[PDB]
Q: What sequence folds into this?
């Protein structure tokens, strides 16, 4: 049913984001988002997406998100398509009342397009 | 905990109705099924360099009633972009569904397609 | 979407699919609460497959082939890779047979990169 499909595709787009869109935002210096790296601290220190902050997945709570503005949209990302980090983390953020959005592809897809930091 | 039998069944069934894979699409084209219209959402230049067989060119931010008036709403539209990192197919799928077409996005895009027919 | 809508979306998604890591940990611990099923052809399964997995080709899933399987366990289907539908299609048939199914996103392809099947 055309309408059912429209809502499906629309919602899907509201839950996830791709490398291109995220890439453009960071280059434009968008202040409306907060790119969060769900990987371990060590992985983040070796390299990570530009302007991204570090907040390991099983460490997401109100103590680590108190300084984050609920006025911005959180964008989580893990290693790649084989990881759940971004989705899991997205849940914890949405549960803490944040406007979360997972980055499908993670660092893996990002590397192929853009450069790490 | 995973999901309930019935809930799961509906989930997997719906998912299958929204997306298609390389194999299924490949079979349809091979035996030249006139019940689908494979549309390439990438830029015109990308489509001219190479594209999936029997696919037509209709750039994403160019999908409207002027470009879909010659397309039969009796057929199922199948959009596809570059690969998993692209939104083109999903975005385009929305515009088609909004124009009253029976749309279906191709998960994987050209990237996955290349790996299979070669 | 609104925080709550998102939470339910991500939660449900996690209940329908599983990743290499999680599945990997379960097998290594020798969990008896899951049944890893290979949806690929019999020949593909005999050449190599994920450890402790059983063989049940997709278009062969019915009550005759699932009568010996415990509905007390969670079925985990898997095909070749991201470009395949096997896992999703099979998942539907299992959920339809009243099983607590869960598809493995990535298939053998993703599993190889991490772990070393038998």
A:
């Amino acid at each position: 049913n055309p309408n059912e499909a429209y809502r499906h595709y629309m919602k899907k787009l509201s839950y996830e984001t791709d490398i291109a869109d995220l890439s453009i935002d960071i280059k434009k210096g968008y202040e409306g988002i907060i790119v969060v790296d769900v990987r371990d601290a060590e992985a983040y220190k070796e390299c990570h997406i530009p302007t991204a902050i570090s907040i390991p997945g099983n460490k997401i709570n109100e103590d680590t998100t108190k300084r984050l503005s609920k006025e911005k949209v959180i964008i989580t990302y893990c290693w790649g398509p084989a990881c759940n980090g971004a989705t899991k983390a997205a849940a914890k953020f949405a549960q803490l009342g944040f406007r979360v959005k997972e980055l499908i592809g993670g660092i893996e897809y990002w590397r192929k397009e853009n450069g790490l930091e």
Q: What stands out?
A: Chain A has one domain: 1-117. Residues 2-15 of chain A form the longest helix (14 residues). The CA atoms of residues 18 and 104 of chain A lie 6 Å apart. Chain A touches chain C through 20 residues (CB under 8 Å).
